[PDB]
Design a protein around this nucleic acid. Structure first.
Length: 148
RNA sequence: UUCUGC
């Protein structure tokens, strides 16, 4: 229990309007595409930012990821379906868990990474954003250019 | 718990 614990009741009532979530304990061989597909099982079209950092030296990710949901209620959908479940049906070790992210909001996450050096590694390792509203909601958006 | 030290 800390300032980043996710409480569903206070999300539903509007007490906590944070939208960015840290996904924990990801097996290090997951790719960004696999994570996107994993989330889309229950939350397709409900988020507009996804980043799973890939350590290019190894063949592994850092074990966690950050996702910005468009509406806070979508956290309840993802959490109630995935929290406590195994990342791999053959291994009890890695269990999906969530908490609030320390950087909140699509705008802040864009500003964090648009000038970052990871934007010039392979696109498979880059943060991704998606259309937040309208008929194109959920489609991938070009990341804004560096502004520094 | 994200990083042009990270």
């Amino acid at each position: 229990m800390d300032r980043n614990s996710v409480d569903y009741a206070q999300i539903a009532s509007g007490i906590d309007t944070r939208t960015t979530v840290m996904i924990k304990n990801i097996p290090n061989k997951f790719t960004q595409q696999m994570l996107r597909d994993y989330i889309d099982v229950t939350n397709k079209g409900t988020y507009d930012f996804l980043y799973l950092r890939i350590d290019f030296v190894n063949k592994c990710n850092v074990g966690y990821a950050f996702i910005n949901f468009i509406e806070p209620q979508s956290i309840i959908t993802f959490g109630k379906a995935r929290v406590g479940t195994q990342w791999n049906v053959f291994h009890s070790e890695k269990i999906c868990d969530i908490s609030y992210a320390n950087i909140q909001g699509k705008d802040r996450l864009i500003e964090k990474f648009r000038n970052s050096c990871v934007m010039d590694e392979n696109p498979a390792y880059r943060p991704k954003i998606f259309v937040s509203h309208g008929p194109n909601r959920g489609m991938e958006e070009p990341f804004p250019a560096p502004n520094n």
